[PDB]
Amino acid sequence: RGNLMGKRVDFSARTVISGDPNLELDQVGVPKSIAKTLTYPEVVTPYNIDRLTQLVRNGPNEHPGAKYVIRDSGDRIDLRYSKRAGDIQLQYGWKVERHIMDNDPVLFNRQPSLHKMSMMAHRVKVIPYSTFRLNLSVTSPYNADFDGDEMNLHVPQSEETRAELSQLCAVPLQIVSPQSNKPCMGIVQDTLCGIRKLTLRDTFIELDQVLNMLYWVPDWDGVIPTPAIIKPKPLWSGKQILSVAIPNGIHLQRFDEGTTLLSPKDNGMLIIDGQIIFGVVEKKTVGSSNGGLIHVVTREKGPQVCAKLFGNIQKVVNFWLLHNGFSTGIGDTIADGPTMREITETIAEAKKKVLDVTKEAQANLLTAKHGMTLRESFEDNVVRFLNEARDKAGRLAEVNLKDLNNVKQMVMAGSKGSFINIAQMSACVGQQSVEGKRIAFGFVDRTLPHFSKDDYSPESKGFVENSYLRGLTPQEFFFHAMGGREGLIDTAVKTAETGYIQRRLVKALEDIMVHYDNTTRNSLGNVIQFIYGEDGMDAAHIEKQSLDTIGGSDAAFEK
């Protein structure tokens, strides 16, 4: 299980990774020094020679070069020594370990591997600086960030091993993934916070810029599109240009919760033929979503057309975004004078609602809910009395955050951030829980030696009435400290249990492949399914599609 099923191996490498906006989706930024070390045996062939004898000439430490040349006898000319390394006549047949080059096919990898996608194929763009670089989008299938992650890379060594890489494992071939019969790669952070930005109706772009963006899309046909506005000035809308990155025959249709072929809220999303007609672009569209633009452009146009889609949407949005810019300040976590006063009362009532329940229950007037104690239904009550207060105060803050608030903007864009992220920051942080129940009586019948015994009130049992913006008090803090920890503890234990689940899960099914009678079996020929998935189909090419026989009136059906 350690020297046969999983061996240590040659032609490998690893380094810190950093992301790269002007790198292609299927590309792997490989620093020059690694590129200098990893080889691919190439056989001397009438076609290549001239580029090959050149690669010998260059020697083993100036990029497009080589170490070792292998001959008839199968001897091994080392090119860092050898009296004949600035010489050598390349006979047909011989092998010529060469530096790994631009547009080779390499296997790129992050651990822990838990996918097909955790091992992709890439094309090697070689670069300066010591990091592997990758396209932001190739983030999810690898589960990378740049908080310090390292990544592996493996290099084929036969012509067929290369085939198998670029014909099966290549990133664009993985874009639409069998897992959730949806695609797995999207548009993230800036691109996604900027594409929303660019796109809202109020974003107008004048000539000088509209020329540069257009240039920026590599697949520009070199035809300025007519401006939406021709009047007092000519301007082009946000939507207007980005639409130049969207290839042709791409029709997309969404509609959201208020949306009527006029999108007053600029709701939803209609794309008639490579051009967007209404609605703000954002995740639901350009995400890793089901109906999304990526899902379509893949099936409709191709894999590699949609590989280069990530490229073009980014090259343009990035650029735009570079020049409008985007921040977050503690200004963005302040909320209205009255909204602060108005939030505090909104807590102060959940405060007298607990009081009044405890006041009630202590006088034995609390009815025990069926199948639970008096003690239990009072607990269940008070918790749902302070959660309904966090949410009520958090809402009351979310409603005050005007459209111009940078946090509320990444929430609309869906780049990072949630509701609760606001609720806690600007409003109040809410109850702290451990073991499932609110903060324990660790000390005899109290929580901290700063309280009396038998204090079931909100504060004493671990409600954090304050916001991260106002600041937690010493207890509030230590209570938070307790929860926080119970987190880390499972996130530590959670993941060890998991990677074991996976390990059997894998080891159980292992040998199940679809056989040439389209049947599903193991090594013995014991059938498991008689048609894979009960329908014969590969998950990659499946899609959500409404069956409009099922719903509707008996009448309206006939009609």
The window from 82-90, 355-363, 389-397, 469-477 that contacts other proteins (CB under 8 A) reads 469-477
Q: Of residues 75, 147, 435, 534, which one binds RNA by CB under 7 A?
A: 147
When asked if residue 112 is in the footprint of RNA (CB under 7 A), the reply is yes
81 binds other proteins (CB under 8 A): no
d(Cα 151, Cα 15) in Å, to the nearest integer?
6
Contacted entry of other proteins, RNA, Mg ion, none for residue 519, CB cut-off 5 to 8 Å set by kind = other proteins
| Ligand-binding site membership of 145 (annotated) | yes
Residues 350-409 that bind other proteins (CB under 8 A): 371, 403-404, 406-407
| Contact call for residue 148 and RNA (CB under 7 A) | yes
Q: Residue 144 Cβ, how far from Mg ion at the closest point, in Å?
A: 7
Pairwise CA distance, residues 114 & 267, whole Å: 37
Tokens at 520, concatenated: 């599903």
Q: Tell me how crowded residue 61 is: count the other CB atoms within 10 A of its CB.
A: 12
Residue 140 binds RNA, judged by CB under 7 A: no
Q: Calculate the CA 484 to chain-centre distance.
A: 25
CA–CA dist 351, 345 (Å, integer): 9
- Decide: is 118 part of the binding site for other proteins (CB under 8 A): yes
First to last CA, the chain: 65
Residues in the site for Mg ion, rule: CB under 5 A?
Answer: 145, 147, 149
| 18, 33, 54, 111: which one binds RNA (CB under 7 A) | 111
Task: Please list every residue from 489 through 528 that binds other proteins, using CB under 8 A.
Answer: 489-492, 494-495, 497-499, 501-526, 528
Tokens of 300: 């409709």
Ligand-binding annotation for 273, yes or no, is no
- Looking at beta carbons only, is 147 or 208 nearer to RNA? 147
Contact between residue 437 and residue 431 where contact means Cβ atoms under 8 Å apart: no
Residue 436: partners with Cβ closer than 8 Å, 6 or more residues away? none
Q: Which of 40, 65, 63, 45 is nearest to 55 (CA)?
A: 65
Q: Is 249 in the site for other proteins (CB under 8 A)?
A: yes
CA distance 103 to 253: 37
Please return the burial class of 438, using the count of CB atoms within 10 Å of its CB with bins 0-12, 13-18 and 19+.
Answer: buried
Residue 91 in the binding site for other proteins (CB under 8 A): no
Q: Which stretch binds other proteins (CB under 8 A): 81-89, 128-136, 355-363, 386-394?
A: 128-136
Q: Which of 160, 256, 349, 388 binds other proteins (CB under 8 A)?
A: 160
Closer CB to other proteins, 364 or 508, in the complex? 508
21 in contact with other proteins (CB under 8 A):
yes
Binds 346: which of other proteins, Mg ion, RNA, none (CB < 5-8 Å by kind): none
* Nearest Cα residue to 189 out of 66, 328, 11: 328
Please identify which residue in 62, 150, 349, 388 interacts with other proteins, judged by CB under 8 A.
Answer: 150
Give the binding-site size for other proteins (rule: CB under 8 A): 272
Check binding of 150 to RNA (CB under 7 A). yes
Q: Which residues pair with 520 in a beta bridge?
A: 514, 529
CB closer to other proteins out of 364 and 535? 535
Q: How far is the CB of 41 from other proteins (least distance, A)?
A: 9
Answer whether 297's CB lies under 8 Å from 247's CB: yes
The answer to whether 24 and 307 have CB atoms below 8 angstroms apart is yes
Tell me, by CB under 7 A, how many residues bind RNA: 7
What's CA 174's distance to the chain center, in Å?
14
Nearer to other proteins, 252 or 361 (CB): 252
Binders in 167-196 for other proteins, by CB under 8 A:
167-169, 178-182, 189-191, 193-194
Q: Which CB, 365 or 474, lies closer to other proteins?
A: 474
Residues whose CB falls within 8 Å of the CB of residue 249, separated by 6 or more in sequence, listed in order:
273, 274, 300, 301
Question: Which residues face 237 on adjacent strands?
Answer: 204
Q: Is the CB of 11 or the CB of 357 nearer to other proteins?
A: 11
Q: C-alpha distances in angstroms, 290 versus 127, 286, 287, 294?
A: 35, 10, 9, 9
CB of 312 to other proteins, least distance (A): 13
- Considering only residues 475 through 494, tell me which ones interact with other proteins, judged by CB under 8 A: 475, 477-478, 480-492, 494
Beta carbon nearer to Mg ion, 147 or 435: 147
50 is in an annotated binding site: no
Dihedral angle over CA of 409, 185, 492, 146, nearest 10: -70
Residue 303 near which of RNA, Mg ion, other proteins, none (CB within 5-8 Å, type-dependent): none
Contact residues for 298 (Cβ-Cβ < 8 A; gap 6+) = 175, 176, 183, 306
Q: Give the phi and the psi of residue 28 in degrees, each rounded to 5.
A: -125, 105
Question: Interface with RNA by CB under 7 A: which range of 147-155, 334-342, 369-377, 509-517?
Answer: 147-155
DSSP 265-283: T--S-EEETTEEEES---H
Among 216, 270, 209, CA closest to 238: 209
What CA–CA distances, in Å, run from 319 to 195, 287, 322? 11, 19, 5
Using CB distances below 5 to 8 A depending on partner kind, what does residue 271 bind out of RNA, other proteins, Mg ion, none? none
* Contact set for other proteins, span 194-223 (CB under 8 A): 194, 200-202, 204, 207-208, 211-212, 214-216, 220-223
By rule CB under 8 A, what string of x and - marks binding of each residue 55-74 to other proteins?
Answer: --------------------
Quick one: which H or E segment has residue 74? none
Residue positions forming the annotated binding site for Mg(2+): 145, 147, 149
Residue positions forming the annotated binding site: 145, 147, 149
Return residues touching RNA (CB under 7 A).
111-112, 145, 147-150
